[PDB]
From a paper:
One enzyme in particular, 2-aminomuconate-6-semialdehyde dehydrogenase (AMSDH), is responsible for oxidizing the unstable metabolic intermediate 2-aminomuconate-6-semialdehyde (2-AMS) to 2-aminomuconate (2-AM). On the basis of sequence alignment, AMSDH is a member of the hydroxymuconic-semialdehyde dehydrogenase (HMSDH) family under the aldehyde dehydrogenase (ALDH) superfamily. The complete AMSDH model includes four polypeptides per asymmetric unit describing one homotetramer. Each monomer of AMSDH contains three domains: a subunit interaction domain, a catalytic domain and an NAD+ binding domain.
Structures of AMSDH in ternary complex with co-substrate NAD+ and its primary substrates were obtained by soaking co-crystallized AMSDH-NAD+ crystals with 2-AMS and 2-HMS, respectively. Extra density that fits with the corresponding substrate molecule was observed in the active site of each subunit. Binding of the primary substrates introduced minimal change to the protein structure; the r.m.s.d. for the superimposed structures of substrate-free with 2-AMS- and 2-HMS-bound ternary complex structures are 0.170 and 0.276 Å, respectively. These two primary substrates bind to AMSDH in an identical fashion, with two arginine residues, Arg120 and Arg464, playing an important role in stabilizing the substrate by forming two sets of bifurcated hydrogen bonds with one of the carboxyl oxygens and the 2-amino or hydroxyl group of 2-AMS or 2-HMS, respectively. The observation of two hydrogen bonds being donated by the active site arginines to the 2-amino group of 2-AMS indicates that in the substrate-bound form, 2-AMS may be in its 2-imine rather than 2-enamine tautomer, as an amino group unlikely to accept two hydrogen bonds. 2-AMS is an unstable compound which decays with a t1/2 of about 9 s at pH 7.5 and 37 °C or 35 s at pH 7.0 and 20 °C. Notably, this is its first reported structure. It appears to be stabilized in the enzyme active site in its imine tautomer by forming two sets of bifurcated hydrogen bonds with Arg120 and Arg464 so that the electrocyclization reaction cannot occur. In the ternary complex structures, Cys302 is located at an ideal position to initiate catalysis, which is the attacking state. In the two ternary complex structures, the distance between the sulfur of Cys302 and the C6 of the substrate is ~3.3 Å. Interestingly, in both substrate-bound structures, Glu268 becomes more flexible and exhibits much weaker electron density and increased side chain B-factors compared with average protein B-factors: 37.8 Å2/28.5 Å2 and 66.37 Å2/39.7 Å2.
Numbering used by the authors:
A (entry chain A), B (entry chain B), C (entry chain D), D (entry chain C): 18 to 500
């Protein structure tokens, strides 16, 4: 199996390739051709030229129809996209079938519909001469959008950027994660077969530093760079585009908290924290890695979570009641295990997990770790402050509302928080005080695609979702008519 | 000792001072105390802490009321602010009276009012269990806003950032331009006298690199950096805040065009382009330095503009009938003169101006240049592509509408453009094709503070004005309640 | 052929029927069963009950998909709908094919999309105890919407109401005009076949006074009455629902003007006024029956419009170059011809038309009239002030812009106006001074479904279109949470 | 004392007059001149003319500044306004000082501010020839607004209509209630002294049927009638305006419920129901005349409420700790006492009150009644279904959530509801099911002037508040420019 770049309407190979590895068993899935600087340039130039071709003359309604045809194309190959996402990442098949792929299709449909309904503003004004003036605003395409996406929710996060980019009449050069290149390449096929004009959507494979990603960010031809990934990489990209003053939108890390108050529905909180800590094997930027539980219910909470975490099934993506697959890769598992040892060194009690499961089959050649719960660390421990991106949480007691609010907010990140309480006042009082972009009360990762999505502090720059995406991916121009 | 910093509610001197010079005659106006790194830290820390004090507890209505008291405080000292702006910049007194100071007051009133009226969003959604969920958004203060402003419209541009910063509940550390420090110091006294709590507004004086401006951009304590000035500085600042992923908002250079079609009201277009080229001695980022005129009216337009340009009175701010003051400084004047020589070397015809007037009085020790009009340069000439920021324009003929739109858009900048035509279709057809943030038709620099304002390409990052300011200066947080 | 009512999911007959006549030739097309008071009650009760059934449990996404299925169902029978609308009204087949049916389809898709994208408002407030409160708004179904619709654009106007009613989660009882019952009945079949739950959409046939129309209007079980028709009929309905204080939305008559300024594109204005006067044989509420032309071009306009009007082909719906069909009915034609006589009596010059064409075939038993142009009437003549609703216009000269604005506005109606000018300022200066809900400049009846649509004075009550429809067909409820 | 009409900038008497009675003591406060049909016509004509005068040329900023001067003018006579509202209505001085007068002032400031920030829409569209079109909307004054208002919150409700009417550039003819004419007359003096141009605001005194109220509603020169009062009066007005198809906004009766769930904070709910039942002596449309309390806390609630109700001090507006003043008049007291008798006859148990207090002083000639609580009535009793508009409530037990929702909704009215509960899910789940315009959770009559305010069913037609006012009191016109 081979994964090509898609540049200016053609699938093309490159001089260099790399391996796509299945994290379940360590086996080779495919070879991937790495785009060089020359090919990146060729993509950017093609995307510039496509803005002046047929794509550029489509009405908003016709553009929207064509984006719906993209969505239809993915739906028509639904189970192929499921298989590609599962192979790259080891995610449970049921998750790919119910979240990953349908979200990617819904991304396209939501932004196609938003492109149809969206309008702009009219401002009347008086003038000295008494005849007045009119200011009106219009949305135009920004230009070429460079898209660089991560491996944790491959098609979902890729199409989260590509859908609004296209719905706003932009052209795109997109570089998916080297760990999860498959579903993006299938998306290129769907674009091609749906009649998307050449150069509108281009797909380049590769790495970051000294590869496709870097070259993309350095290219003077782009108008914007949208990115999801690690905070440090965000900082690096922000420096890279600075000489062009390119528009930027970043969704970066977090070290998210969950807070369980004494009035919580306890079993529901246990189940919710189980999901918020261990979904996708802890490899969602939204996962809870720090948990604060009121002292009066702390012991019972920890006990209850231990029992649920030990019933989790860790294994094959299509295994009967599977809850967790492996980590994305052996190198990622190295990092996570390194943090597992660090916690023990910082004085953690390992309530459960803390190692790798023994399967006695091919899974032992994969990148699995156990779901892990810690207790006993101070708020300043490295394991409680640095993003681990694995299936782990630390649980700490608290006593007072104002105290726990300060502890959640004592972080250089600020992406998301989940709070558990049955009390009306507390939900709204406490939520508004958490320094994050996204708070859930009595749930986790419930998404309405119209809402603003983003983080604060190190977790983000800007906001996407609904009209924020329509504003980010558009040139907003103001036209003033003196009457 | 004359202009002090204002930090945590006290005027404070510093270890060194620098001279503030009157560009009308080169005389010393005052000594300005240059904030050092420790003082910049103190200000940022004070601004951090003020977010937890009484300022953080004010209702939106009470905050708005206090901002209106700031406005009223400026108004109460109106003629002092006029004299300060005039002294620093040499602006004609009638212009500081009618444009600069009143706009600064209007900035505070508008954003105070937007703060009281602005609301957020409610999204209802269905869930699996049939009970639904609610997502709602709220605006909160972003944090500490660092404000770095230019010398060309000192109080106007400084308050354009400070007013929405404060209206959104933030605290501020603001660094005015070293060339025009006086009005911003008076503003500090107004804040003090209105009872703004300590730490909420802090003024620091100094330069950029290795001085107060650079220190502010590098401080990890700010949440955002808003800047107006040269594109090159914008790039430097973007790199500096990168490691912190600070929110950024930039209004940068342009090389703006005016276009005059054959069906323009010729007299009105001549007067309009005279204003657009020579207002504030050509020192507005919105000024036209490139003018394109349909060949049928080219000679008449040029002849007319020469006549009107040579009637401009260049002189004292309180001189009878004065139209233009000096440039901001001798250093700026040397840069503009360096372009006046370069234009001649690149082959220009000097229609008028091209040097410095000879006053035979103390004005010869100031920083005056003549209003200049060039003809005969090619589109790739440096004087037609690089921002000069003086009272100059090049006039070129054109023949076809698609041609002139290409020539307007063939620029690394994209701030603003002015079009002159009486034809309904052409106005709207042409305006939407110009790749800028702001187009005026049959006028120039008509401002409605509700409109989105900014540039594209090198001319900017983001938008401000109306709801775009309210969104930039706020954290937008989404709270999701499972029902 | 017989046309049944559709009540609670079943097609049902009634004790009485009335004839549906083809206005082309006077032949019987079908018998239509008239709903009595008991059946209207049954439809209302069914509609009330369906709000408590499955319909009321659908998510907005699922409701929207069902409404898209209605639209697809129309599209799948597109040519049957075309044939139906043509048979009832005599409209040219190509007009039914390009305007009427595609717009009915688009009505459904537009409002389905709006239902998915629309959201409500979140208002935060401070309280005396310092804890604050939240106000959030929600859109709920208003309840049972009664829809009464006219014969001039039967399916388009019927669906213009039914689509947002359904999209907002309401149930409907709809009474189409007795002159054009066929396409509505067909729509009831599409509804049935698409699986719309019983009682959600009910169709009742009949007349107004002393019939289905009036009974619907009097039923205490409805929550709103939306209506398009004669202003006098609006007034009657407003009286009828007053005791229940029902929500009302009315789009009523007009006596619309076109204004042609001296700088108009003359041949384009001639063609535009031809269309605005004689489309659908002048039977559109938006038609121009008053035309004002600048004195300097009056004679040449009148001359040119005469020639174009006499080239119109008046004939069979599928006849080769056909432009106009008959009037809707003999009764309407009696009324139009009465005005034709009145005009001559009031002193008109008949420039063209003024009678009935003579075909010497079966069309002579239909309801045809000639396209007619008058001159020479004063502004007070009844033929110039009262709505005729036939293919007629009166042309008068003017000299001065303010004068013609006054003469346009001197009316008890205020639906629409069309202005012809090539001048940028005039277009905007004049448009804003016309006291109507809709102005077109250099075009007529160009529709964007997001815009507010409606009239002033006797021409309307309320606005519909875009968010205006979403607000009218919803209960907007405010919920205030003390924190 | 005499109260004059204010018509075209002059105070004028009439041929007929009526007595304004102080309800504390039955003494004559003033004689009021009753406008006749000719005076009403004179006011409407003057309002129509003033739309073409200096008022119509004000910029939105200058109009807003003039509206703020009206507000300032009220504030400068603050104690006079307080004395006037007290004299007319008997309302406690403390509450006129803190609710009534301050709210009237805030109505003007809020709508003045909205007027300055409000803007309209721009819609871009494709056309067949590829050139496109623009639709933009503008807000214009609707015309002459007729304002008819009730006696319960005289200045607050009067200004709630007058402020947005004026802020939207309309002119006004206003008829305050015959029972509370004083503060409105004072307001005409403030308008006059603030320099409001003659004819912009006209005040006419009189009654409803066969008097100034009716004459206004029949006058063909008005563009809109906004009304607050009894439902049956709304129905009558809606018939009166029907032949002109005038725009109408009605805020009408309610029979509002409060619901106290078992998990409510009990003492807070008692205090809250006390306020919601007996504020302004129960003469607020928003008052709770029906209370439902969960069975498990019913007896304890009734007992607590009994105690609080008997601690209320009923007496002079300026008496020490007065809580309640008299009813508005003797005629209204006769109606309320009639209901107090009916309740006994319907089987009610009188927990407290039920008659009139005994003062043995001039208050015996007033219109006082006692705070009254009933128990024991069925859901169909007249006293539980009909609006009494006095200081009374009936308390009833309930068992189940769905049950109480059905019972609250089982009404021909639908204005407001208050719910008491500490539970997050319950609050949001139950609130959205209550068929009213306004739900308060854990509070009552908490007002944010931006929110939509209105009722459903017999309780109203339309919404006012924030943008809903700006939309009602403006003509929204759509201008379509073909490019
Ligand atoms: N887009 C707009 O709206 C707009 C408006 C006005 C001015 N401008 C641009 O502003 C320029 C005005 O000139 P200027 O010479 O004041 O610009 P500048 O960029 O040299 O200086 C602007 C400010 O930045 C500070 N500064 C300079 N170097 C810095 C550094 N390394 N770190 C941090 N702060 C630093 C300065 O002290 C000053 O306060 C022109 O380019 C003009 O077009 C743009
Ligand atoms: N927002 C609301 O829903 C709201 C608010 C406050 C009061 N109210 C209602 O107010 C009522 C108490 O007020 P009210 O007794 O003053 O009501 P009312 O209806 O008898 O009269 C109110 C106003 O209407 C005038 N009026 C009476 N009959 C008229 C007619 N035929 N034509 C024209 N005008 C006429 C009166 O002179 C007075 O100015 C209660 O029903 C209460 O629910 C409703
Ligand atoms: N649903 C989403 C999950 C995202 C995680 C990081 O963005 C999203 O981003 O849209
Ligand atoms: N505060 C208010 C009370 C209104 C009661 C009836 O309208 C209001 O209307 O603003
Ligand atoms: Na992989
Ligand atoms: Na200076
Ligand atoms: Na018919
Ligand atoms: Na009275």
């Amino acid at each position: 199996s081979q994964l090509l770049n898609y540049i200016d309407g053609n699938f093309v190979t490159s001089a260099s390739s790399f391996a796509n590895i299945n994290p379940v068993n360590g086996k080779l899935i495919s070879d991937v051709f790495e785009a060089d600087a020359k090919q990146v340039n060729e993509a950017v130039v093609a995307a510039q030229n496509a803005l002046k071709g047929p794509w550029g003359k489509l009405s908003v309604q016709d553009r929207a129809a064509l984006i719906h045809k993209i969505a239809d194309g993915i739906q028509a190959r639904f189970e192929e996209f499921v298989a590609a996402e599962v192979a790259d990442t080891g995610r449970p098949v049921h998750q790919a079938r119910t979240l990953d792929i349908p979200r990617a299709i819904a991304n396209f449909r939501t932004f196609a519909d938003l492109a149809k309904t969206s309008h702009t503003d009219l401002f009347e004004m008086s003038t000295s001469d008494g005849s007045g003036a009119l200011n009106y605003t219009v949305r135009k395409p920004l230009g070429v959008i460079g898209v660089i996406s991560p491996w944790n929710l491959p098609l979902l996060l890729f199409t989260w950027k590509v859908a609004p980019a296209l719905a706003c009449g932009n052209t795109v050069v997109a570089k998916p994660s080297e760990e999860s290149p498959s579903s993006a390449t299938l998306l290129a096929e769907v674009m091609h077969d749906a009649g998307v004009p050449p150069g509108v959507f281009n797909l380049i494979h590769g790495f970051g530093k000294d590869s496709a990603g870097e070259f993309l960010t350095q290219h003077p031809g782009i108008s914007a760079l949208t990115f999801t990934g690690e905070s440090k990489t965000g900082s690096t990209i922000m420096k890279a585009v600075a000489d062009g003053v390119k528009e930027v939108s970043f969704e970066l890390g977090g070290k998210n908290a969950a807070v369980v108050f004494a009035d919580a529905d306890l079993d529901a909180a246990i189940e919710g924290v189980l999901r918020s800590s261990f979904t996708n094997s802890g490899q969602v930027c939204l996962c809870s890695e720090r948990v604060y539980v009121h002292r009066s219910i702390f012991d019972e909470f920890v006990s209850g979570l231990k029992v649920e975490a030990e019933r989790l099934v860790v294994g094959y993506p299509d295994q009967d009641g599977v809850n967790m697959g492996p980590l994305i890769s052996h190198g990622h598992r190295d990092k996570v295990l390194s943090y597992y040892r660090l916690a023990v060194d910082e004085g953690a009690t390992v309530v459960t997990g803390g190692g790798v499961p023994k399967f006695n089959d091919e899974r032992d050649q994969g990148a699995y770790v156990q779901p892990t719960i810690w207790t006993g660390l101070s708020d300043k421990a490295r394991c409680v402050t640095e993003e681990i991106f694995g299936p782990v949480c630390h649980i700490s007691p608290f006593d007072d509302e104002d105290e726990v609010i300060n502890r959640v907010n004592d972080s250089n990140y600020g992406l998301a928080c989940a709070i558990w309480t049955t009390n009306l006042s507390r939900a709204h009082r406490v939520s508004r005080q958490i320094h994050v972009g996204l708070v859930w009360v009595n749930t986790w990762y419930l998404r309405d695609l119209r809402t603003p999505f983003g983080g604060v502090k190190l977790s983000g720059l800007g906001r996407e979702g609904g009209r924020f995406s329509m504003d980010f991916y558009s040139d907003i121009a103001n036209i003033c008519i003196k009457i």
